[PDB]
Amino acid sequence: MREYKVVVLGSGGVGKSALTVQFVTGTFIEKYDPTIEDFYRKEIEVDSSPSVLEILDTAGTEQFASMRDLYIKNGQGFILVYSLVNQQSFQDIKPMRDQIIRVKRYEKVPVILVGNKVDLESEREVSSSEGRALAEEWGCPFMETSAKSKTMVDELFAEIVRQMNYA
Amino acid sequence: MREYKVVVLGSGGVGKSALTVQFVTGTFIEKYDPTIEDFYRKEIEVDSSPSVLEILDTAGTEQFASMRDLYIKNGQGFILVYSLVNQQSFQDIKPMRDQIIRVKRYEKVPVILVGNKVDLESEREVSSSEGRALAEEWGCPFMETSAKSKTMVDELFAEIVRQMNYA
Numbered sequence: 307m308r309e310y311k312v313v314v315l316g317s318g319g320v321g322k323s324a325l326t327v328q329f330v331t332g333t334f335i336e337k338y339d340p341t342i343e344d345f346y347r348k349e350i351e352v353d354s355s356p357s358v359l360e361i362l363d364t365a366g367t368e369q370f371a372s373m374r375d376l377y378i379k380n381g382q383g384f385i386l387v388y389s390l391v392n393q394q395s396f397q398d399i400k401p402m403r404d405q406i407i408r409v410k411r412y413e414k415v416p417v418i419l420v421g422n423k424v425d426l427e428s429e430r431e432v433s434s435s436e437g438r439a440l441a442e443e444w445g446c447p448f449m450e451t452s453a454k455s456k457t458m459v460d461e462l463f464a465e466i467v468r469q470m471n472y473a
Numbered sequence: 474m475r476e477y478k479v480v481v482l483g484s485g486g487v488g489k490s491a492l493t494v495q496f497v498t499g500t501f502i503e504k505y506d507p508t509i510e511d512f513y514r515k516e517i518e519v520d521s522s523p524s525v526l527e528i529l530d531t532a533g534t535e536q537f538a539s540m541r542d543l544y545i546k547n548g549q550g551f552i553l554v555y556s557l558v559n560q561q562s563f564q565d566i567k568p569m570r571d572q573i574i575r576v577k578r579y580e581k582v583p584v585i586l587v588g589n590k591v592d593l594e595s596e597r598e599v600s601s602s603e604g605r606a607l608a609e610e611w612g613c614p615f616m617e618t619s620a621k622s623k624t625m626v627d628e629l630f631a632e633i634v635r636q637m638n639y640a
């Protein structure tokens with residue numbers, strides 16, 4: 307019920323592009339192509355409401371550090387992704403919300419914390435309760451996902467819309 | 474039908490309530506009763522699609538920036554009114570759209586600029602060129618109206634619906 311600008315942030319290879327491409331195409335990318343800066347748009351029915359999601363999928367590998375503030379300035383909603391099989395990506399996510407609040411200057415920014423790659427949880431490095439405790443401290447929702455399933459990815463994107471709708 | 478939440482903004486005595494009640498009930502109100510806050514609901518056919526409007530008619534006297542931020546938060550479309558026979562009400566409207574964007578956080582907010590009381594044009598203090606220039610700077614439609622005109626009032630609410638169908 308408006309245009310929704312979501313920025314997906316997180317370190318290299320956590321599955322930011324696989325999550326966005328699952329949402330947009332219903333396909334799973336199996337190869338790893340490091341992202342420069344990709345924009346997607348899709349219509350979605352969130353609780354029957356028409357919502358045009360515009361998704362900025364950013365670079366994680368070496369990111370584009372200085373520019374991240376520009377991405378944050380322009381974003382309305384933020385999906386903070388880590389890989390649950392990579393402890394370091396989780397650690398890398400911990401300053402991200404503070405950086406968002408710094409750029410935006412207000413505390414109630416719509417964010418979701420995502421632990422991705424749940425289908426690889428035989429090699430889990432970060433437990434649900436850890437992710438969930440970070441999200442609780444931030445006051446935002448926590449989800450765990452696999453970019454392999456359309457269903458999990460659709461609820462992710464549906465939820466960020468609800469968070470942006472209620473701010 | 475879809476819901477359209479519309480907020481009517483501007484300075485004291487420009488005719489916000491009179492426009493709203495002409496729209497809703499088809500009565501022109503002559504008495505000046507300063508508004509605190511009132512909600513109206515009304516179903517209109519815009520380009521033959523039924524649209525239901527929930528209109529928030531606001532106070533114009535004794536500003537209160539915080540109340541205005543709440544009014545804005547709940548609205549998806551905005552009608553900014555000045556009285557063409559009151560120059561100060563036109564200058565008063567000029568910060569208003571910027572406050573709207575600030576509160577909303579999204580850039581392309583549906584707005585129409587209205588110079589009301591065109592029936593009292595013998596006392597016009599704000600020319601059509603001026604009002605039209607502010608609207609061309611804002612990139613929004615401009616209208617001059619009279620609350621005594623069912624035709625102009627219905628075209629005003631019809632047009633805010635069209636703008637909200639855009640963004």
Ligand SMILES: Nc1nc2c(ncn2[C@@H]2O[C@H](COP(=O)(O)OP(=O)(O)OP(=O)(O)O)[C@@H](O)[C@H]2O)c(=O)[nH]1
Nearest residue numbers: 318319320321322323324336340341366367423453
């Ligand atoms: N098994 C599995 N692999 C995943 C999943 N999500 C991502 N991958 C794989 O992990 C690799 C990286 O995924 P990308 O989406 O390219 O990672 P990214 O976060 O976009 O990386 P950058 O663009 O470099 O920041 C690819 O080989 C993906 O197939 C998932 O949930 N399950």
Ligand SMILES: Nc1nc2c(ncn2[C@@H]2O[C@H](COP(=O)(O)OP(=O)(O)OP(=O)(O)O)[C@@H](O)[C@H]2O)c(=O)[nH]1
Nearest residue numbers: 486487488489490491502503507508533590619620
């Ligand atoms: N002649 C004429 N009078 C108008 C018109 N619109 C409003 N008025 C009159 O101007 C006075 C104020 O109108 P309201 O609609 O109450 O003004 P308002 O903007 O709601 O004022 P607040 O609620 O105090 O902010 C009343 O006497 C109205 O009848 C119009 O188009 N023509």
Ligand SMILES: [Mg+2]
Nearest residue numbers: 322323340341
């Ligand atoms: Mg990528």
Ligand SMILES: [Mg+2]
Nearest residue numbers: 489490507508
């Ligand atoms: Mg009033």
